[PDB]
Design an enzyme around this catalytic site. Sequence first.
Site, short mmCIF file in Angstrom:
data_model
loop_
_atom_site.label_atom_id
_atom_site.label_comp_id
_atom_site.label_asym_id
_atom_site.label_seq_id
_atom_site.Cartn_x
_atom_site.Cartn_y
_atom_site.Cartn_z
N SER A 112 -0.17 3.06 -1.99
CA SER A 112 0.37 3.73 -0.81
C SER A 112 0.88 5.13 -1.18
O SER A 112 0.13 5.91 -1.76
CB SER A 112 1.46 2.88 -0.15
OG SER A 112 1.58 3.20 1.22
N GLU A 237 -7.81 3.86 1.44
CA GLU A 237 -7.19 2.85 2.29
C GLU A 237 -6.04 3.47 3.07
O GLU A 237 -5.45 4.46 2.64
CB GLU A 237 -6.74 1.62 1.48
CG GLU A 237 -5.57 1.85 0.51
CD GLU A 237 -4.20 1.58 1.12
OE1 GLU A 237 -3.21 2.17 0.63
OE2 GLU A 237 -4.09 0.79 2.08
N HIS A 305 -3.00 -2.49 1.62
CA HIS A 305 -1.72 -3.05 2.05
C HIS A 305 -1.81 -4.51 2.49
O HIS A 305 -0.79 -5.14 2.76
CB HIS A 305 -1.13 -2.22 3.19
CG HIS A 305 -0.57 -0.90 2.76
ND1 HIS A 305 -1.36 0.16 2.35
CD2 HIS A 305 0.71 -0.45 2.72
CE1 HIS A 305 -0.59 1.19 2.06
NE2 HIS A 305 0.67 0.85 2.28
N1 AMP Z 1 10.73 -4.61 7.52
C1 AMP Z 1 9.45 -4.93 7.22
N2 AMP Z 1 8.83 -5.97 7.83
C2 AMP Z 1 7.55 -6.30 7.54
N3 AMP Z 1 6.80 -5.64 6.64
C3 AMP Z 1 7.30 -4.57 5.96
C4 AMP Z 1 8.69 -4.15 6.22
N4 AMP Z 1 8.92 -3.09 5.42
C5 AMP Z 1 7.78 -2.85 4.72
N5 AMP Z 1 6.82 -3.73 5.03
C6 AMP Z 1 5.45 -3.78 4.46
O1 AMP Z 1 5.41 -3.11 3.20
C7 AMP Z 1 4.43 -2.07 3.20
C8 AMP Z 1 5.12 -0.72 3.21
O2 AMP Z 1 5.16 -0.24 1.88
P1 AMP Z 1 4.65 1.24 1.52
O3 AMP Z 1 3.25 1.32 2.09
O4 AMP Z 1 4.70 1.24 0.01
O5 AMP Z 1 5.64 2.16 2.20
C9 AMP Z 1 3.59 -2.26 4.45
O6 AMP Z 1 2.41 -2.99 4.10
C10 AMP Z 1 4.47 -3.07 5.39
O7 AMP Z 1 3.72 -4.02 6.15
#
Ligand code: AMP
Lengths: 335, 335
Positions: A112, A237, A305
Amino acid sequence: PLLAAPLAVGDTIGFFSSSAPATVTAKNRFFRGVEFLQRKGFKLVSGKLTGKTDFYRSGTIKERAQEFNELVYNPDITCIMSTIGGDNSNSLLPFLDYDAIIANPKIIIGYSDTTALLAGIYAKTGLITFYGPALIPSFGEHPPLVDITYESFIKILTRKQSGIYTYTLPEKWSDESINFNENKILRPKKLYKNNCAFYGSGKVEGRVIGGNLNTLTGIWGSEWMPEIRNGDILFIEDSRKSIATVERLFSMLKLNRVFDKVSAIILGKHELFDCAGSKRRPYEVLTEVLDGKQIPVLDGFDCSHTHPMLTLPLGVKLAIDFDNKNISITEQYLS
Amino acid sequence: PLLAAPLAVGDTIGFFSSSAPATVTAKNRFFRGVEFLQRKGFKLVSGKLTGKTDFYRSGTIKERAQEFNELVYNPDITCIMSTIGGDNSNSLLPFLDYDAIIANPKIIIGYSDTTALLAGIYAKTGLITFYGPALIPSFGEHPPLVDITYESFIKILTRKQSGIYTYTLPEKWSDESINFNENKILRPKKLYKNNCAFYGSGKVEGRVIGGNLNTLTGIWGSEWMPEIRNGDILFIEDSRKSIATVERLFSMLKLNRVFDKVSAIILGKHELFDCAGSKRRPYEVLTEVLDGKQIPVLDGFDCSHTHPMLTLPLGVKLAIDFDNKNISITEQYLS
Ligand SMILES: Nc1ncnc2c1ncn2[C@@H]1O[C@H](COP(=O)(O)O)[C@@H](O)[C@H]1O
Ligand SMILES: Nc1ncnc2c1ncn2[C@@H]1O[C@H](COP(=O)(O)O)[C@@H](O)[C@H]1O
C-alpha cells in the site's frame, strides 16, 4: 541487483510506522500480529514510534525517517517490516539513509502506502524489496486466511535460491470489512472462490515493477520513481477506490507511455472496488484506456489488500505463463 | 504565448462535460447557471453530452474528447467553458485536436479536474488558458457570491490589455456545503471575513503555473505536464482533502524539486479542509515539507473551490507584492 540475505526462523524482525499510527488506533490487531510472529519463533524489535500518535500520522517527517534508519543500523535485524500504510511514507524519501542500506542490505517488506519506500529504495540503491505483509493488517488477520499469508511469506523469504519458483493459488479469498480490531469474532469472513483470470496467450518474462498505483502518484516524476523499461511486467494494485479514480490512474499510466513499454500487466485483486452502479470491473476500464492495444493481463493476483496475501519481490524477472495459467519468479532475489 | 481573442458582451459560450455528468445530477444548479449567463447577454452552445449519463461520467473517453473538439471546430464560439469537474478529464488528452486549438484559439476556462485539460492544452500548444468559473458550480451559485465571481470573470476576460491588472479582494467568502442543487433555499450560506495572508517580503514576479494539485497527479511525468522552470510562481489549490492527502501532495512536489525552482507559491483557499483534529492549516504542513527552504507564500487566494472565485490566466507573469499585500497580472494574456 543488490540482494539481501534470506530470512530464517528465529531471526529478528524490526517494525516501523511510516504513516498511520495503527499501533495505537488498532492496538488489538497489532498485538495479535506481534503474538503471531513471536509464536513462529521470530524476535521482534519495535521502532521508536510504536505507541505514539501525531493525529493522522505516527510522527514528524524527520522522526519517521529516523525510525526507519535506526532499524537499518541495527545489525541484529534481518527483516524490516511495515506496521501499516496510510498516506505519508513518500515524505520520508529525502531523509532515508540509502548509503547505509547499500552497506547493510536487509529484507524490506510492506504494501500500500509503503510502496513509496519500496520503490524509492529500489530507485536509489537497486535493492530488491518486497511487496508483502505488513504486521498489523496482514499478520493481525484471524485464521484461516493469516496462515496462507504466512505460508507465502515464509516460503518466498526462506527458500533456497535454485530454479524458478511457481506461485500457489489461494483456494479462497476475502475482502470483507469485518473483524479488524475486534478481539473476538462474531462470524468468520465471507470466503470467495478464486476468480483470477489470465487474459492472453504464450509466456511473458520480464522485470516486475510497480506496487500500489495510487501511492505511486506521490513519487511520480522524481528520482525516487524507478524508470519503467521496455519489456517490464507492470504490477499494480489499489484498494477501496471508485471507478472514477481507477480510470484516472490508468489514464495517467497511458499518458506516461507505460503501456507502450510493458509486455504484461498484473492487476492485484481490488479490495471493495466501487463501480458506481456500472457493474464494471477494473479490467474493463483498463481495456477502454488501452484503446485497442493488446497487452496480456493477469487479473486478480493475490498480492494486494485482499486476504490472503502473497509475497512478491520487486525488480526481478517473473514469467507469466498464460497458457498454463501460472506465474513464477525466474531471477535470484535473495543472496 | 498563444493568445485567444478577448471576450465581449453578447459572445457565444460553449460548454462541455469532460468528467462528472452534472447537467443531469445537478440539473437545478445547471439551469440556474445557464439562465444566469443568458441574462448577461451571452449565447450558449450545449456540448453534445449535455443531459447524458454513463454512471460516474458523461460518456466514454472518446465521446468526451469528441464533445470538446466539436466546440473547438465551431467558429461562432469565443469561450469554451467546463460544466463541472470530477476525476476523468486526463483521459481525453491523447484525443484532443491540438492542431485545431492552435488554428482556432479560444478562451478555455474551468477548474478542479479540468486542470488536466488546461495544463495539457498549454503544454501542447502554448495557449494561455484560464483557471476560473465552471458553469454549474460557479454560475449556479446563488447571490450574493455569484455576482462577485461574475465580476472577476467579466473584468479579466473583457478588459483592455494595457498596464498591469491588480486583483480585488473579496470582502466575504464561504465554503459551506449547503444550497448546491436545491431549487429553494432555507437560509444563506455563512459568510467569513477574508483571512488571506501574505508570508514574505518584497515583490516576486514570475510565470504562474499549476492548478488543482490532486488533479495534476493524473498528468504528472507526461508530455502533457507543463515543465516547471526556475523563477515560476506555483499556483495550487485543493478541495475537501484530508491533511494526510495534503502532506502527500506537498511531498510529491518536494521530491520533484519544485521547491528548488519556484520563486513564490500561491495557495488557493482549501474548501472544507479536514485537519483530522490537529487544528493545522495547509500552510503549516507546507512549512514542514519545505524543511527550511524560504519561499514566500500567498496563503488563501480566492481562486479555488470556495465562493466567490476569481479568474486567473495560467502561463503568464504575475507580480505578488508581499509588502503591499496584493497580486497583479503583468503579462498580456488575451489578444
Ligand atoms: N477500521 C477498519 N475496519 C476495517 N478494515 C480496516 C480498518 N482500518 C484499516 N482497515 C484495512 O486495512 C487496510 C488499510 O491499510 P493501508 O492500505 O496500509 O492503509 C485496508 O485493506 C482496510 O480494509
Ligand atoms: N452534492 C453536492 N453538495 C454540495 N456541493 C457539491 C455537490 N456536488 C458538487 N459540489 C461542489 O461543486 C464544486 C465543484 O466540483 P468539482 O468540479 O468536482 O471540483 C466543489 O466545490 C464541490 O464541493
